[PDB]
Amino acid sequence: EMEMKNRQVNHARNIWDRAITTLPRVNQFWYKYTYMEEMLGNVAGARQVFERWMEWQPEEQAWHSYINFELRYKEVDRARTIYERFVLVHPDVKNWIKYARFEEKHAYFAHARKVYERAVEFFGDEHMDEHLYVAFAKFEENQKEFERVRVIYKYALDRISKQDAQELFKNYTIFEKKF
Amino acid sequence: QGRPREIINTYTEAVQTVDPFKATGKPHTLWVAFAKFYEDNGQLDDARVILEKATKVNFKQVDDLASVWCQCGELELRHENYDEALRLLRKATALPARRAEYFDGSEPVQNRVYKSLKVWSMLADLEESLGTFQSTKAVYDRILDLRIATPQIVINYAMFLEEHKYFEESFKAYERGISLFKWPNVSDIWSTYLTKFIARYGGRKLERARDLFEQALDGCPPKYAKTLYLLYAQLEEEWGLARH
């Protein structure tokens, strides 16, 4: 902070690179380097520092910040290429439902079909963590009725002992009936 | 001004509009009219380029696209022989099958029943004159709606009865009429087709016919005015059983 407060930018970057190489487990120095790069230009050194921070096995809060910084820089191919190794590290239910983020920008039909096939071919063939089916039903209700009645009724092989939830059976029935 | 002919020039100015802004259906209807001016321009000359240029606007999410393609299908019906009209209408009618609507806009849903069922109906199974309707073309229209459609129910079930005339088309018409619209809107036509199909397919004085007719209409609202009886009551009294 004392080096960034002054007009020296070469020594500040050399101190930040040494702090990032000596303390790889620290996250405050990486956040300060990301803030200094956002205060600076949009050169490829910021993307290289982000790739070096992501290659050091970061958490989901750093991956979400990198995805937000990529989405706030008008990047479509670079955001989709950097999202392939994010789902392969943390296979969470919040990360599997956020992997199909290209449908919310240009509606990405082939990419949504590939993401649905990857979500059906992933882990959870018997329970699906009670979160992929509701998102698939919402994506089918927002789109046309191609496979909206199939995955809600004929795909009950991955259900857990009651074929629905307690407060989400009549709601799913009303969502499938009136759409 | 000089609409049929003046210099054989200003018709291009009639097709010249531009001024890009927010509009729905105006450039497509005026583009189809410009395709009629192209029909007076020598017909297929410049017409296919206008249909291909106006065929892609953003990604789906418009009812004017399939309306302009269907209008080109009507101009293809004005084209006499149905060979090329059926090939171009078959490919252009098969394009919405992959992707229909609901990309971005003010429409919450896709609503491909109207436009998609209109293009599929113009391609095959018109139930009036044009032929070349395959046995799977009715399932291609029911799959074209992909959920439920009411625009051509009576006529759709009549076409499935023309191509088949069996109990499978009657049960599919009853399910498509029940899931079509709640209450005896299309379900009343499903009841009429259930009695007529019950007599002409399931056999006269059949127990399953009364079981299904009494099962679908069981609770019911009061129909148009009311009928809870005369169909099933008269059918049961005419079945030869004075007890039931």
Curated annotation (Swiss-Prot), chain A:
Species: Homo sapiens
Assembly, per entry: Identified in the spliceosome C complex. Present in a spliceosome complex assembled in vitro containing CRNKL1, HPRP8BP and SNRPB2. Component of the minor spliceosome, which splices U12-type introns. Isoform 2 seems to be predominant in the spliceosome complex. Interacts with PPIL2 (via the PPIase cyclophilin-type domain); they may form a trimeric complex with HSP90.
Function: Involved in pre-mRNA splicing process. As a component of the minor spliceosome, involved in the splicing of U12-type introns in pre-mRNAs.
Subcellular location: Nucleus; Nucleus speckle
Parent-protein residues present: 284 to 462 of 848
Tree of life domain: Eukaryota
Tissue: Widely expressed. Highly expressed in testis. Not detected in brain and lung.
Record protein name field: Crooked neck-like protein 1
HAT repeat copies, ranges: 7-39, 41-72, 74-105, 107-142, 144-178
Annotated family: Belongs to the crooked-neck family.
Disulfide bonds: none
From Swiss-Prot, chain B:
Localisation per UniProt entry: Nucleus
Record-listed N6-acetyllysine modification sites: K53
Coiled-coil intervals: none
UniProt repeat feature HAT, residue ranges: 2-40, 131-163, 165-199, 204-238
Described function: Involved in pre-mRNA splicing as component of the spliceosome. Involved in transcription-coupled repair (TCR), transcription and pre-mRNA splicing.
Subunit (UniProt): Associates with RNA polymerase II, the TCR-specific proteins CKN1/CSA and ERCC6/CSB, and XPA. Identified in the spliceosome C complex. Component of the XAB2 complex, a multimeric protein complex composed of XAB2, PRPF19, AQR, ZNF830, ISY1, and PPIE. Identified in a pentameric intron-binding (IB) complex composed of AQR, XAB2, ISY1, ZNF830 and PPIE that is incorporated into the spliceosome as a preassembled complex. The IB complex does not contain PRPF19.
Family under the similarity heading: Belongs to the crooked-neck family.
Protein name, entry field: Pre-mRNA-splicing factor SYF1
Span of the entire protein shown here: 368 to 611 of 855
